[PDB]
Design a protein around this motif. Structure first.
Motif, PDB file in Angstrom:
ATOM      1  N   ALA A 126       0.119  -4.115   2.427  1.00 54.91           N
ATOM      2  CA  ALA A 126      -1.258  -3.656   2.398  1.00 54.91           C
ATOM      3  C   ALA A 126      -2.092  -4.357   3.455  1.00 54.91           C
ATOM      4  CB  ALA A 126      -1.875  -3.883   1.019  1.00 54.91           C
TER       5      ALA A 126
ATOM      6  N   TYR B 199      -3.494   7.279  -3.258  1.00 58.03           N
ATOM      7  CA  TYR B 199      -2.988   5.998  -2.770  1.00 58.03           C
ATOM      8  C   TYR B 199      -3.114   4.919  -3.841  1.00 58.03           C
ATOM      9  CZ  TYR B 199      -7.896   4.931  -1.438  1.00 58.03           C
ATOM     10  OH  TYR B 199      -9.229   4.692  -1.409  1.00 58.03           O
TER      11      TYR B 199
ATOM     12  N   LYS C 148       3.536  16.174   1.006  1.00 58.98           N
ATOM     13  CA  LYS C 148       3.130  15.021   1.793  1.00 58.98           C
ATOM     14  C   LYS C 148       4.321  14.103   2.032  1.00 58.98           C
ATOM     15  CE  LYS C 148      -1.162  13.659   1.206  1.00 58.98           C
ATOM     16  NZ  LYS C 148      -2.248  14.533   1.749  1.00 58.98           N
TER      17      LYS C 148
ATOM     18  N   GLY D  85       0.539   5.288   0.313  1.00 59.68           N
ATOM     19  CA  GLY D  85      -0.386   6.354   0.643  1.00 59.68           C
ATOM     20  C   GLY D  85       0.331   7.686   0.689  1.00 59.68           C
ATOM     21  N   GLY D  86      -0.418   8.774   0.598  1.00 63.66           N
ATOM     22  CA  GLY D  86       0.190  10.093   0.668  1.00 63.66           C
ATOM     23  C   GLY D  86       0.792  10.592  -0.622  1.00 63.66           C
TER      24      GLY D  86
ATOM     25  N   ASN E  38       9.037   4.492   2.383  1.00 63.67           N
ATOM     26  CA  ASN E  38       8.221   4.873   3.530  1.00 63.67           C
ATOM     27  C   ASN E  38       8.771   6.143   4.167  1.00 63.67           C
ATOM     28  OD1 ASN E  38       6.073   4.560   5.369  1.00 63.67           O
ATOM     29  ND2 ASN E  38       7.507   3.747   6.899  1.00 63.67           N
TER      30      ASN E  38
ATOM     31  N   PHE F  10       0.868  -1.173   0.000  1.00 60.22           N
ATOM     32  CA  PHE F  10       0.000   0.000   0.000  1.00 60.22           C
ATOM     33  C   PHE F  10       0.904   1.221   0.000  1.00 60.22           C
ATOM     34  CE2 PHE F  10      -1.802   3.479   2.536  1.00 60.22           C
ATOM     35  CZ  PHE F  10      -2.956   3.744   1.817  1.00 60.22           C
TER      36      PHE F  10
ATOM     37  N   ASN G 153      -1.971  14.209  -5.394  1.00 60.85           N
ATOM     38  CA  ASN G 153      -3.136  13.763  -6.145  1.00 60.85           C
ATOM     39  C   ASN G 153      -3.006  14.055  -7.630  1.00 60.85           C
ATOM     40  OD1 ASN G 153      -3.514  16.530  -6.238  1.00 60.85           O
ATOM     41  ND2 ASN G 153      -5.439  16.542  -5.082  1.00 60.85           N
TER      42      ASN G 153
ATOM     43  N   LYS H  81      -6.864   9.543  -5.824  1.00 59.92           N
ATOM     44  CA  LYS H  81      -7.128   9.674  -4.385  1.00 59.92           C
ATOM     45  C   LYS H  81      -5.853   9.685  -3.559  1.00 59.92           C
ATOM     46  CE  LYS H  81     -11.823   7.524  -4.273  1.00 59.92           C
ATOM     47  NZ  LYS H  81     -12.441   6.133  -4.381  1.00 59.92           N
TER      48      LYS H  81
END
Length: 198
Positions: free
Chosen positions: A193, A160, A186, A122-123, A179, A120, A126, A158
């Protein structure tokens, strides 16, 4: 009938502004240049675009070329990874091919099944498109599957995504390398995940 749904595919994540003509010309050329056709000429007969939901249905001239076109799941078109799926109403009749017999080099599947090596991410800003996010992730080697999640209302990411590397043994290096990475305003979250799945 069922033969007709055996000649149709859902194509999701189509870029804004794409015309029927642009989609036809892309898919016909790429199938022929990729060697996915089985006869002379163009394999796609029709495209129906829903601009409100960024999907299309393509209708092909043959069952087998429809099946082979599934090998283009994830093909990049104007920066976006096209999602190629069977129609929900599709059912193969006996004797009908189901899986593509060819792998197209460079095409990364959009289907990311849950697994010990599924990540996964994220951040993400967009505004980064599918190709740009893949570009970041391929800093650690080629991807086996990848999908960036989109917002239906804004026509935009979105922020992610999910992925898996061809070489599963790079997974922890990629977590460590990405990470917490500062990307624009961001900071990335990168983890397996399964850690955060609902």
């Amino acid at each position: 009938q069922m033969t007709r749904q055996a000649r149709r595919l859902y194509v999701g994540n189509i870029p804004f502004g794409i015309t029927e003509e642009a989609m036809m010309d892309f898919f016909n050329a790429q199938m022929r240049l990729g060697g996915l056709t089985q006869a002379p000429g163009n394999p796609v007969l029709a495209v129906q675009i829903n601009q409100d939901k960024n999907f299309a249905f393509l209708e092909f001239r043959s069952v087998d070329e429809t099946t082979q076109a599934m090998a283009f799941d994830g093909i990049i078109f104007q920066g976006q990874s096209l999602k190629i799926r069977r129609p929900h109403d599709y059912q193969p009749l006996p004797g009908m091919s189901e899986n593509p017999s060819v792998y197209v080099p460079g095409v990364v599947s959009t289907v990311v099944p849950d697994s010990a090596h599924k990540l996964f991410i994220g951040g993400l800003p967009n505004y980064l498109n599918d190709d740009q996010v893949k570009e970041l992730l391929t800093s650690f080697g080629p991807l086996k599957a990848f999908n960036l999640v989109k917002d239906s209302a804004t026509g935009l990411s979105k922020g992610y995504a999910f992925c898996e590397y061809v070489d599963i043994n790079v997974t922890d290096q990629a977590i460590a390398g990405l990470n917490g990475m500062q990307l624009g305003d961001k900071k990335l979250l990168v983890q397996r995940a399964s850690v955060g799945a609902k």
